[PDB]
A paper describes a structure:
The 3.3 Å resolution structure of URAT1 in complex with urate revealed critical details about the substrate binding site. The density maps clearly showed urate bound within a pocket formed by residues from transmembrane helices TM5, TM7, TM8, and TM10. The urate molecule primarily engages in π-stacking interactions with phenylalanine residues F241, F360, F364, F365, and F449. Additionally, a polar interaction between urate and K393 further stabilizes the binding, as evidenced by the substantial decrease in transport activity upon K393A mutation. Interestingly, we observed that S35 in TM1 forms a water-mediated hydrogen bond with urate. Alanine substitution of S35 also resulted in a notable reduction in the transport activity of URAT1, highlighting the importance of this interaction. While transporters like OAT1 typically employ a combination of phenylalanine and tyrosine residues to create their substrate-binding aromatic cages, URAT1 exclusively utilizes phenylalanine residues. This characteristic likely renders the binding pocket of URAT1 more hydrophobic than those of other transporters. Moreover, the binding pocket is relatively narrow, with an 8.2 Å separation between F241 and F449, compared to ~9.1 Å in rOAT1. These features impose stringent selection criteria based on substrate polarity and size, contributing to the high substrate specificity observed for URAT1.
The human urate transporter 1 (hURAT1) plays a critical role in urate homeostasis by facilitating urate reabsorption in the renal proximal tubule, making it a key target for gout therapy. The human urate transporter 1 (URAT1) is a crucial member of the SLC22A subfamily, which includes both organic anion transporters (OATs) and organic cation transporters (OCTs). The overall architecture of URAT1 comprises three distinct regions: the transmembrane domain (TMD), the extracellular domain (ECD), and a predicted intracellular helical (ICH) bundle, which was not resolved in our structures. The TMD of URAT1 displays a characteristic Major Facilitator Superfamily (MFS) topology, consisting of 12 transmembrane helices arranged in two pseudo-symmetric halves: the N-terminal domain (NTD, TM1–TM6) and the C-terminal domain (CTD, TM7–TM12).
Numbering used by the authors: 21 to 61, 67 to 226, 228 to 282, 338 to 465, 467 to 516
The structure:
Protein backbone atom coordinates (compact mmCIF):
# COMPACT_ATOMS: atom_id res chain seq x y z
CA UNK A 1 0.00 0.00 0.00
CA UNK A 2 2.90 2.33 0.76
CA UNK A 3 4.36 1.87 -2.72
CA UNK A 4 1.09 2.81 -4.43
CA UNK A 5 0.66 5.69 -1.97
CA UNK A 6 4.07 7.11 -2.93
CA UNK A 7 3.13 6.50 -6.58
CA UNK A 8 -0.08 8.53 -6.34
CA UNK A 9 1.78 11.14 -4.28
CA UNK A 10 4.21 11.66 -7.16
CA UNK A 11 1.21 11.52 -9.51
CA UNK A 12 -0.20 14.54 -7.68
CA UNK A 13 3.00 16.56 -8.14
CA UNK A 14 3.08 15.47 -11.80
CA UNK A 15 -0.57 16.44 -12.45
CA UNK A 16 -1.12 19.62 -10.41
CA UNK A 17 2.33 20.85 -11.51
CA UNK A 18 0.63 23.30 -13.89
CA UNK A 19 0.10 25.63 -10.91
CA UNK A 20 3.85 26.36 -10.72
CA UNK A 21 5.12 25.40 -14.18
CA UNK A 22 2.51 27.65 -15.83
CA UNK A 23 2.55 30.45 -13.26
CA UNK A 24 2.27 33.95 -14.72
CA UNK A 25 4.66 36.63 -13.38
CA UNK A 26 4.20 40.37 -13.74
CA UNK A 27 5.00 41.23 -17.35
CA UNK A 28 5.05 44.23 -19.67
CA UNK A 29 6.17 45.34 -23.12
CA UNK A 30 9.85 45.57 -23.96
CA UNK A 31 10.78 49.25 -23.86
CA UNK A 32 13.98 51.01 -24.98
CA UNK A 33 13.64 53.47 -22.08
CA UNK A 34 13.50 50.67 -19.48
CA UNK A 35 15.30 47.63 -20.96
CA UNK A 36 18.24 49.50 -22.56
CA UNK A 37 21.11 51.06 -20.61
CA UNK A 38 21.50 53.77 -23.26
CA UNK A 39 18.41 55.74 -22.20
CA UNK A 40 17.57 54.25 -18.79
CA UNK A 41 17.51 56.67 -15.86
CA UNK A 42 14.50 60.78 -13.08
CA UNK A 43 12.85 58.08 -10.94
CA UNK A 44 12.43 54.59 -12.45
CA UNK A 45 8.74 54.39 -11.50
CA UNK A 46 8.13 57.61 -13.41
CA UNK A 47 9.92 56.09 -16.42
CA UNK A 48 7.67 53.02 -16.18
CA UNK A 49 4.61 55.28 -15.98
CA UNK A 50 5.60 57.48 -18.94
CA UNK A 51 6.83 54.58 -21.10
CA UNK A 52 3.86 52.20 -20.66
CA UNK A 53 0.21 53.33 -20.40
CA UNK A 54 -1.63 52.49 -17.18
CA UNK A 55 -3.64 49.29 -17.47
CA UNK A 56 -6.14 47.36 -15.36
CA UNK A 57 -6.07 47.53 -11.55
CA UNK A 58 -4.27 50.91 -11.81
CA UNK A 59 -1.06 49.02 -12.64
CA UNK A 60 1.06 49.52 -15.77
CA UNK A 61 -0.50 47.73 -18.72
CA UNK A 62 0.57 44.10 -19.04
CA UNK A 63 0.72 44.61 -22.81
CA UNK A 64 1.04 48.18 -24.13
CA UNK A 65 3.72 50.74 -24.92
CA UNK A 66 3.78 54.37 -26.04
CA UNK A 67 5.39 55.30 -29.34
CA UNK A 68 7.53 57.94 -27.61
CA UNK A 69 8.21 58.62 -23.91
CA UNK A 70 5.19 60.67 -22.84
CA UNK A 71 6.68 63.42 -20.68
CA UNK A 72 3.28 65.15 -20.74
CA UNK A 73 1.96 62.89 -17.95
CA UNK A 74 4.95 63.16 -15.59
CA UNK A 75 4.29 66.75 -14.50
CA UNK A 76 1.57 67.01 -11.80
CA UNK A 77 0.02 70.24 -13.14
CA UNK A 78 -1.53 68.22 -16.00
CA UNK A 79 -4.36 65.72 -15.63
CA UNK A 80 -3.70 62.01 -16.07
CA UNK A 81 -5.06 59.70 -18.81
CA UNK A 82 -4.99 62.60 -21.29
CA UNK A 83 -2.93 60.53 -23.74
CA UNK A 84 -4.71 59.10 -26.77
CA UNK A 85 -4.74 55.32 -27.19
CA UNK A 86 -3.81 55.70 -30.88
CA UNK A 87 -0.17 56.22 -29.82
CA UNK A 88 0.14 52.78 -28.17
CA UNK A 89 1.98 49.65 -29.29
CA UNK A 90 1.03 46.07 -28.28
CA UNK A 91 4.55 44.94 -27.34
CA UNK A 92 6.01 45.33 -30.84
CA UNK A 93 9.51 44.59 -29.50
CA UNK A 94 8.86 41.69 -27.12
CA UNK A 95 8.11 41.06 -23.44
CA UNK A 96 9.93 41.16 -20.11
CA UNK A 97 9.14 39.19 -16.95
CA UNK A 98 9.91 39.75 -13.27
CA UNK A 99 12.23 36.92 -12.18
CA UNK A 100 11.81 37.74 -8.47
CA UNK A 101 9.51 34.80 -7.71
CA UNK A 102 9.95 32.42 -10.65
CA UNK A 103 13.17 32.41 -12.66
CA UNK A 104 11.63 30.67 -15.69
CA UNK A 105 8.13 29.52 -16.63
CA UNK A 106 6.35 28.29 -19.74
CA UNK A 107 4.44 31.59 -19.75
CA UNK A 108 7.68 33.58 -19.90
CA UNK A 109 9.38 31.27 -22.42
CA UNK A 110 6.69 31.19 -25.14
CA UNK A 111 4.99 34.52 -24.30
CA UNK A 112 1.62 33.32 -23.03
CA UNK A 113 0.24 36.87 -22.84
CA UNK A 114 -2.83 38.94 -23.77
CA UNK A 115 -2.65 38.18 -27.50
CA UNK A 116 -2.42 34.43 -26.73
CA UNK A 117 -3.59 34.24 -23.11
CA UNK A 118 -5.95 31.44 -24.12
CA UNK A 119 -2.98 29.09 -24.60
CA UNK A 120 -2.41 28.33 -20.90
CA UNK A 121 -6.05 27.32 -20.24
CA UNK A 122 -5.91 25.60 -23.63
CA UNK A 123 -2.81 23.79 -22.38
CA UNK A 124 -4.67 22.66 -19.25
CA UNK A 125 -7.62 21.58 -21.41
CA UNK A 126 -5.30 19.54 -23.66
CA UNK A 127 -3.78 17.98 -20.53
CA UNK A 128 -7.22 16.98 -19.28
CA UNK A 129 -8.15 15.67 -22.74
CA UNK A 130 -5.03 13.51 -22.64
CA UNK A 131 -6.15 12.33 -19.21
CA UNK A 132 -9.54 11.37 -20.66
CA UNK A 133 -7.94 9.58 -23.63
CA UNK A 134 -5.57 7.65 -21.38
CA UNK A 135 -8.37 6.62 -19.04
CA UNK A 136 -10.47 5.49 -22.01
CA UNK A 137 -7.59 3.54 -23.59
CA UNK A 138 -6.20 1.90 -20.44
CA UNK A 139 -9.22 -0.40 -20.27
CA UNK A 140 -8.51 -2.73 -23.20
CA UNK A 141 -4.74 -2.36 -22.74
CA UNK A 142 -4.82 -3.47 -19.10
CA UNK A 143 -7.40 -6.16 -19.88
CA UNK A 144 -5.30 -7.69 -22.68
CA UNK A 145 -1.61 -7.08 -21.91
CA UNK A 146 -1.93 -7.54 -18.14
CA UNK A 147 -2.13 -5.39 -15.02
CA UNK A 148 1.63 -5.08 -14.39
CA UNK A 149 2.71 -4.71 -18.03
CA UNK A 150 0.52 -1.62 -18.42
CA UNK A 151 1.92 -0.33 -15.12
CA UNK A 152 5.50 -0.65 -16.37
CA UNK A 153 4.59 0.88 -19.73
CA UNK A 154 2.87 3.82 -18.03
CA UNK A 155 5.88 4.37 -15.77
CA UNK A 156 8.27 4.33 -18.74
CA UNK A 157 6.03 6.68 -20.74
CA UNK A 158 5.74 9.04 -17.77
CA UNK A 159 9.51 9.18 -17.31
CA UNK A 160 10.22 9.64 -21.03
CA UNK A 161 7.58 12.33 -21.56
CA UNK A 162 8.69 14.15 -18.42
CA UNK A 163 12.36 14.27 -19.39
CA UNK A 164 11.23 15.30 -22.88
CA UNK A 165 8.94 18.13 -21.76
CA UNK A 166 11.66 19.34 -19.40
CA UNK A 167 13.64 20.32 -22.52
CA UNK A 168 10.82 21.23 -24.92
CA UNK A 169 12.05 23.90 -27.37
CA UNK A 170 8.63 24.80 -28.78
CA UNK A 171 5.07 25.19 -27.53
CA UNK A 172 3.39 22.53 -29.74
CA UNK A 173 6.09 20.00 -28.83
CA UNK A 174 5.57 20.79 -25.14
CA UNK A 175 1.80 20.42 -25.61
CA UNK A 176 2.21 17.01 -27.26
CA UNK A 177 4.61 15.89 -24.53
CA UNK A 178 2.14 16.98 -21.84
CA UNK A 179 -0.65 15.19 -23.72
CA UNK A 180 1.31 11.92 -23.71
CA UNK A 181 2.31 12.47 -20.08
CA UNK A 182 -1.34 12.95 -19.12
CA UNK A 183 -2.23 9.80 -21.07
CA UNK A 184 0.30 7.84 -19.02
CA UNK A 185 -0.78 9.57 -15.79
CA UNK A 186 -4.42 8.59 -16.28
CA UNK A 187 -3.42 5.05 -17.24
CA UNK A 188 -1.32 4.59 -14.11
CA UNK A 189 -4.04 6.26 -12.03
CA UNK A 190 -6.65 3.76 -13.19
CA UNK A 191 -4.18 0.90 -12.73
CA UNK A 192 -3.31 1.96 -9.17
CA UNK A 193 -6.98 2.40 -8.30
CA UNK A 194 -8.01 -1.00 -9.63
CA UNK A 195 -4.99 -2.76 -8.09
CA UNK A 196 -5.86 -1.25 -4.71
CA UNK A 197 -9.60 -1.91 -4.85
CA UNK A 198 -9.22 -5.49 -6.11
CA UNK A 199 -6.45 -6.65 -3.75
CA UNK A 200 -6.66 -4.58 -0.55
CA UNK A 201 -10.44 -4.74 0.01
CA UNK A 202 -14.87 -4.63 3.97
CA UNK A 203 -12.10 -2.04 4.29
CA UNK A 204 -12.81 -0.50 0.85
CA UNK A 205 -13.56 3.00 2.26
CA UNK A 206 -10.44 2.80 4.43
CA UNK A 207 -8.18 1.95 1.48
CA UNK A 208 -9.86 4.59 -0.68
CA UNK A 209 -9.35 7.21 2.03
CA UNK A 210 -5.71 6.14 2.38
CA UNK A 211 -5.13 6.50 -1.37
CA UNK A 212 -6.81 9.90 -1.54
CA UNK A 213 -4.87 11.04 1.54
CA UNK A 214 -1.67 10.05 -0.25
CA UNK A 215 -2.91 12.16 -3.15
CA UNK A 216 -3.49 15.03 -0.70
CA UNK A 217 0.02 14.61 0.71
CA UNK A 218 1.05 15.00 -2.93
CA UNK A 219 -0.11 18.62 -2.65
CA UNK A 220 2.25 19.35 0.23
CA UNK A 221 4.97 17.49 -1.65
CA UNK A 222 4.56 19.60 -4.80
CA UNK A 223 4.44 22.75 -2.66
CA UNK A 224 7.68 21.89 -0.86
CA UNK A 225 9.33 20.95 -4.16
CA UNK A 226 8.23 24.09 -6.02
CA UNK A 227 9.37 26.25 -3.09
CA UNK A 228 12.93 25.08 -3.73
CA UNK A 229 13.65 25.12 -7.47
CA UNK A 230 11.15 27.63 -8.93
CA UNK A 231 12.52 26.68 -12.38
CA UNK A 232 10.01 24.85 -14.55
CA UNK A 233 12.69 22.88 -16.43
CA UNK A 234 14.47 21.65 -13.31
CA UNK A 235 11.06 21.27 -11.65
CA UNK A 236 9.79 18.92 -14.37
CA UNK A 237 13.13 17.08 -14.34
CA UNK A 238 13.21 16.42 -10.59
CA UNK A 239 9.49 15.53 -10.60
CA UNK A 240 9.75 13.09 -13.54
CA UNK A 241 13.05 11.43 -12.55
CA UNK A 242 11.63 9.20 -9.74
CA UNK A 243 9.39 7.30 -12.17
CA UNK A 244 12.39 5.94 -14.09
CA UNK A 245 13.72 4.63 -10.76
CA UNK A 246 10.35 3.17 -9.78
CA UNK A 247 10.38 1.38 -13.15
CA UNK A 248 12.92 -0.98 -11.53
CA UNK A 249 9.89 -2.75 -9.99
CA UNK A 250 9.13 -4.26 -13.42
CA UNK A 251 8.18 -7.94 -13.08
CA UNK A 252 8.77 -7.55 -9.32
CA UNK A 253 12.51 -6.87 -9.62
CA UNK A 254 13.03 -9.21 -12.59
CA UNK A 255 10.98 -12.04 -11.04
CA UNK A 256 13.17 -11.87 -7.91
CA UNK A 257 -22.23 -1.90 -20.45
CA UNK A 258 -23.73 1.57 -20.11
CA UNK A 259 -26.57 0.75 -22.53
CA UNK A 260 -28.88 -0.09 -19.60
CA UNK A 261 -28.75 3.43 -18.12
CA UNK A 262 -32.22 4.36 -19.41
CA UNK A 263 -34.20 1.22 -18.39
CA UNK A 264 -32.37 1.02 -15.04
CA UNK A 265 -31.98 3.52 -12.21
CA UNK A 266 -32.24 6.58 -14.44
CA UNK A 267 -32.53 9.07 -11.58
CA UNK A 268 -29.58 7.66 -9.65
CA UNK A 269 -27.47 7.50 -12.82
CA UNK A 270 -28.13 11.08 -13.89
CA UNK A 271 -27.65 12.50 -10.38
CA UNK A 272 -24.41 10.57 -9.88
CA UNK A 273 -23.09 11.72 -13.25
CA UNK A 274 -24.04 15.30 -12.36
CA UNK A 275 -22.20 15.14 -9.02
CA UNK A 276 -19.10 13.62 -10.64
CA UNK A 277 -19.17 16.26 -13.40
CA UNK A 278 -19.50 18.99 -10.76
CA UNK A 279 -16.60 17.62 -8.72
CA UNK A 280 -14.32 17.40 -11.76
CA UNK A 281 -15.35 20.84 -13.02
CA UNK A 282 -14.88 22.66 -9.71
CA UNK A 283 -11.69 20.86 -8.69
CA UNK A 284 -9.79 21.06 -11.97
CA UNK A 285 -10.96 24.65 -12.39
CA UNK A 286 -9.88 25.84 -8.94
CA UNK A 287 -6.88 23.56 -8.38
CA UNK A 288 -5.08 24.96 -11.46
CA UNK A 289 -5.32 28.73 -10.80
CA UNK A 290 -4.35 29.13 -7.13
CA UNK A 291 -2.48 32.32 -8.09
CA UNK A 292 -5.82 34.16 -8.28
CA UNK A 293 -7.42 32.54 -5.21
CA UNK A 294 -4.81 33.78 -2.71
CA UNK A 295 -1.87 36.10 -2.17
CA UNK A 296 0.88 33.46 -1.91
CA UNK A 297 0.88 30.28 -3.98
CA UNK A 298 3.17 28.02 -1.94
CA UNK A 299 1.49 28.86 1.37
CA UNK A 300 -1.90 28.40 -0.29
CA UNK A 301 -0.97 24.91 -1.52
CA UNK A 302 0.48 23.98 1.88
CA UNK A 303 -2.69 25.11 3.65
CA UNK A 304 -4.80 23.30 1.03
CA UNK A 305 -3.04 20.03 1.81
CA UNK A 306 -2.88 20.47 5.59
CA UNK A 307 -6.62 21.21 5.64
CA UNK A 308 -7.60 18.56 3.07
CA UNK A 309 -6.02 15.82 5.20
CA UNK A 310 -8.20 16.49 8.30
CA UNK A 311 -11.18 17.51 6.16
CA UNK A 312 -11.04 14.12 4.46
CA UNK A 313 -10.56 12.40 7.82
CA UNK A 314 -13.69 14.11 9.15
CA UNK A 315 -15.58 13.35 5.94
CA UNK A 316 -14.76 9.65 6.29
CA UNK A 317 -15.78 9.76 9.96
CA UNK A 318 -19.11 11.43 9.16
CA UNK A 319 -19.75 9.00 6.30
CA UNK A 320 -19.14 6.12 8.72
CA UNK A 321 -21.36 7.67 11.41
CA UNK A 322 -24.19 8.74 9.07
CA UNK A 323 -25.70 8.20 5.65
CA UNK A 324 -23.85 8.94 2.43
CA UNK A 325 -26.54 11.26 1.04
CA UNK A 326 -26.66 13.83 3.91
CA UNK A 327 -22.87 14.09 4.22
CA UNK A 328 -22.51 14.50 0.45
CA UNK A 329 -25.22 17.16 0.28
CA UNK A 330 -23.70 19.02 3.23
CA UNK A 331 -20.19 18.92 1.75
CA UNK A 332 -21.43 20.11 -1.65
CA UNK A 333 -23.43 22.97 -0.11
CA UNK A 334 -20.48 23.96 2.08
CA UNK A 335 -18.06 24.00 -0.86
CA UNK A 336 -20.51 26.00 -2.98
CA UNK A 337 -21.13 28.57 -0.26
CA UNK A 338 -17.40 28.82 0.45
CA UNK A 339 -16.54 29.50 -3.20
CA UNK A 340 -19.43 31.98 -3.45
CA UNK A 341 -18.14 33.87 -0.41
CA UNK A 342 -14.63 33.65 -1.90
CA UNK A 343 -15.77 35.36 -5.09
CA UNK A 344 -17.92 37.76 -3.04
CA UNK A 345 -15.31 38.84 -0.47
CA UNK A 346 -13.35 41.95 -1.56
CA UNK A 347 -9.85 41.33 -2.90
CA UNK A 348 -8.17 43.34 -0.12
CA UNK A 349 -9.06 40.61 2.42
CA UNK A 350 -6.49 38.22 1.02
CA UNK A 351 -6.23 36.05 4.13
CA UNK A 352 -10.00 35.54 4.30
CA UNK A 353 -10.09 34.89 0.54
CA UNK A 354 -7.39 32.22 0.86
CA UNK A 355 -9.18 30.67 3.84
CA UNK A 356 -12.42 30.43 1.85
CA UNK A 357 -10.53 28.97 -1.12
CA UNK A 358 -8.91 26.32 1.08
CA UNK A 359 -12.28 25.51 2.67
CA UNK A 360 -13.87 25.07 -0.76
CA UNK A 361 -10.99 22.95 -2.06
CA UNK A 362 -11.34 20.72 0.99
CA UNK A 363 -15.10 20.51 0.58
CA UNK A 364 -14.80 19.43 -3.05
CA UNK A 365 -12.42 16.65 -1.99
CA UNK A 366 -14.85 15.56 0.71
CA UNK A 367 -17.62 15.49 -1.90
CA UNK A 368 -15.35 13.42 -4.15
CA UNK A 369 -14.87 10.92 -1.31
CA UNK A 370 -18.63 10.78 -0.73
CA UNK A 371 -19.48 10.24 -4.40
CA UNK A 372 -16.75 7.60 -4.71
CA UNK A 373 -18.23 5.72 -1.76
CA UNK A 374 -21.79 6.21 -3.02
CA UNK A 375 -21.08 4.97 -6.56
CA UNK A 376 -20.42 1.45 -5.20
CA UNK A 377 -23.82 1.40 -3.46
CA UNK A 378 -26.19 3.31 -5.77
CA UNK A 379 -26.25 0.46 -8.29
CA UNK A 380 -26.30 -3.35 -7.93
CA UNK A 381 -23.38 -5.55 -8.94
CA UNK A 382 -24.99 -6.06 -12.36
CA UNK A 383 -24.95 -2.28 -13.00
CA UNK A 384 -21.89 -1.37 -10.90
CA UNK A 385 -20.15 0.28 -15.64
CA UNK A 386 -21.79 2.99 -13.55
CA UNK A 387 -18.71 4.00 -11.54
CA UNK A 388 -16.71 4.01 -14.77
CA UNK A 389 -19.23 6.27 -16.50
CA UNK A 390 -19.21 8.53 -13.44
CA UNK A 391 -15.43 8.84 -13.43
CA UNK A 392 -15.46 9.44 -17.19
CA UNK A 393 -18.00 12.25 -16.77
CA UNK A 394 -15.85 13.66 -13.96
CA UNK A 395 -12.87 13.72 -16.32
CA UNK A 396 -15.05 15.32 -19.00
CA UNK A 397 -16.05 18.07 -16.60
CA UNK A 398 -12.44 18.50 -15.54
CA UNK A 399 -11.68 19.02 -19.24
CA UNK A 400 -14.09 21.95 -19.53
CA UNK A 401 -12.96 23.26 -16.13
CA UNK A 402 -10.00 25.38 -17.25
CA UNK A 403 -11.94 26.47 -20.34
CA UNK A 404 -14.18 28.58 -18.07
CA UNK A 405 -11.13 30.65 -17.09
CA UNK A 406 -11.41 32.11 -20.60
CA UNK A 407 -14.53 33.94 -19.36
CA UNK A 408 -12.29 36.06 -17.11
CA UNK A 409 -12.12 38.67 -19.87
CA UNK A 410 -15.77 39.59 -19.25
CA UNK A 411 -15.06 39.62 -15.51
CA UNK A 412 -12.70 38.06 -12.97
CA UNK A 413 -15.62 37.03 -10.75
CA UNK A 414 -17.51 35.06 -13.41
CA UNK A 415 -15.26 31.94 -13.42
CA UNK A 416 -15.32 31.79 -9.62
CA UNK A 417 -19.05 32.55 -9.73
CA UNK A 418 -19.56 29.46 -11.90
CA UNK A 419 -17.21 27.41 -9.71
CA UNK A 420 -19.33 28.39 -6.71
CA UNK A 421 -22.75 27.98 -8.32
CA UNK A 422 -22.00 24.49 -9.69
CA UNK A 423 -21.59 22.79 -6.26
CA UNK A 424 -24.85 24.37 -5.07
CA UNK A 425 -26.78 22.76 -7.92
CA UNK A 426 -24.84 19.52 -7.40
CA UNK A 427 -25.91 19.40 -3.75
CA UNK A 428 -29.50 20.32 -4.60
CA UNK A 429 -29.54 17.41 -7.07
CA UNK A 430 -27.89 14.99 -4.63
CA UNK A 431 -30.52 15.92 -2.02
CA UNK A 432 -33.02 13.97 -4.16
CA UNK A 433 -31.02 10.73 -4.09
CA UNK A 434 -32.90 7.71 -2.62
O1 LIG B 1 -8.14 11.82 -4.93
C1 LIG B 1 -8.24 12.20 -6.05
N1 LIG B 1 -7.93 13.61 -6.39
C2 LIG B 1 -8.06 14.07 -7.76
O2 LIG B 1 -7.81 15.20 -8.03
C3 LIG B 1 -8.52 13.12 -8.84
N2 LIG B 1 -8.74 13.30 -10.27
C4 LIG B 1 -9.19 12.01 -10.82
O3 LIG B 1 -9.46 11.80 -11.95
N3 LIG B 1 -9.24 11.04 -9.72
C5 LIG B 1 -8.83 11.72 -8.50
N4 LIG B 1 -8.69 11.26 -7.11
Amino acid sequence: TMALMVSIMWLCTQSMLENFSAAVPSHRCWAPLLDNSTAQALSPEALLAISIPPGPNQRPHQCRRFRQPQWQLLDPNATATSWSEADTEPCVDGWVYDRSIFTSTIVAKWNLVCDSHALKPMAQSIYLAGILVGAAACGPASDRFGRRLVLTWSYLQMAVMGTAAAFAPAFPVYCLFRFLLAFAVAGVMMNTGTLLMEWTARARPLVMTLNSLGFSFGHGLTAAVAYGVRDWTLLQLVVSVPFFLCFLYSWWLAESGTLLRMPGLRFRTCISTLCWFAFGFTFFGLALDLQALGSNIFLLQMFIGVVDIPAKMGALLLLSHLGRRPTLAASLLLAGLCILANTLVPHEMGALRSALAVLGLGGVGAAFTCITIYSSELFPTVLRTAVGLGQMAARGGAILGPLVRLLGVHGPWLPLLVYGTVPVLSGLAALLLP
